[PDB]
């Protein structure tokens, strides 16, 4: 036994599976070759509780008007693809009434259902790692730290691509001020092979055609500014390169469908019009 007694007031001073259907609003997704679906950290998206509400004004919950699947621009997977990234809610800023509520309010909160679709025949090869990264900070391309500008950090539904090797932006007069995400460094100075600590799913073309990730709202705050802060980052990397019948030049589309969930907005004002690239 030992005896412990606190001699101070403040406690700081104390000693230390395959067939699935997803319906949101007026949108429905059917899948037959699914590898199940992952709920990030086992937490389903939810609305702010009265015990955690910071803003006092009544929130607006568009529900089905905004809690529905929006499909982003399709990308092409080739043998030379290094990977793609999107930022949420940034990727949905021009998507129906969700983007309208996003830009008309000072504070916004939403979870997501991300559905990545990549169908290929039984004679194709390749694997895609689909990772949901909270606070997916990406490295810049200049000797100046944290120098990436807002326009490039928020590409929108197109997102960005990973790079095979790091290139330094030496243009002093007109710096690019863009990201330089290196695929094997995961764009953030960490080995990509460890990226599986994040919620993820692998689309192995021999097994499944799609991946589904249910992202809860993750943040150090109950609600934040959606225009300032991207809660999530979706990163897709080719773990196994695409291959097909030795024909070469094969390319298959990857489509991304994101549904915001449990959307809450506070602080209605005039609409925000961010500066464009």
């Amino acid at each position: 036994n030992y005896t412990t007694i606190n001699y101070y007031r403040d406690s700081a001073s104390n000693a230390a599976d395959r067939v699935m259907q997803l319906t949101l609003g007026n949108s429905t997704i059917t899948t037959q070759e699914a590898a199940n679906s992952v709920v990030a950290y086992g937490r389903w998206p939810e609305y702010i509780k009265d015990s955690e509400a910071n803003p006092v004004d009544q929130p607006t919950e568009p529900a089905v008007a905004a809690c529905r699947f929006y499909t982003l621009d399709t990308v092409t997977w080739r043998k030379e693809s290094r990977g793609w990234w999107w930022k949420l809610p940034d990727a949905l800023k021009d998507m129906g009434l969700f983007g309208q509520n996003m830009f008309y309010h000072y504070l916004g909160r939403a979870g997501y259902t991300v559905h990545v679709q990549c169908n290929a025949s039984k004679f194709h090869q390749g694997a895609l790692g689909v990772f949901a990264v909270p606070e997916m900070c990406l490295a810049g391309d200049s000797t100046t730290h944290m120098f990436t500008k807002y326009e490039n950090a928020n590409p929108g539904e197109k997102g960005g691509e990973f790079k095979g090797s790091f290139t330094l932006d030496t243009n002093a007069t007109n710096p690019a001020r863009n990201f330089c995400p290196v695929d094997y460094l995961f764009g953030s100075g960490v080995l990509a092979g460890n990226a599986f600590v994040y919620p993820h799913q692998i689309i192995n073309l021999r097994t499944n055609n799609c991946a589904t990730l249910v992202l809860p709202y993750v943040n150090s705050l109950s609600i934040d500014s959606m225009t300032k802060h991207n809660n999530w980052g979706i990163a897709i990397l080719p773990l196994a390169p695409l291959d097909f019948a030795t024909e070469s030049s094969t390319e298959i589309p990857i489509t991304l469908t994101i549904a915001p969930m449990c959307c809450e907005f506070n602080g209605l004002r005039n609409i925000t019009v961010p500066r464009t690239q």
Partner: protein, 60 residues
């Protein structure tokens, strides 16, 4: 679907209630009622057009 067993695909069958321009592309069509049909072991798909009318009856 009356292709071979070795054929695979996905179709989108869409119903748009009237009032707007008739959908000329899949991007417009997916905003209305619709079903995504996967062609596999089951070669048939049913899309129900729901009764969405201002009047209680339509003319023929």
């Amino acid at each position: 679907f009356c292709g071979s067993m070795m054929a695979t695909g996905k179709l989108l069958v869409s119903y748009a209630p009237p009032g707007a321009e008739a959908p000329k592309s899949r991007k417009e069509a997916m905003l209305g009622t619709h079903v995504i049909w996967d062609i596999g072991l089951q070669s048939s798909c049913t899309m129900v057009v729901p009764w969405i009318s201002n009047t209680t009856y339509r003319l023929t």
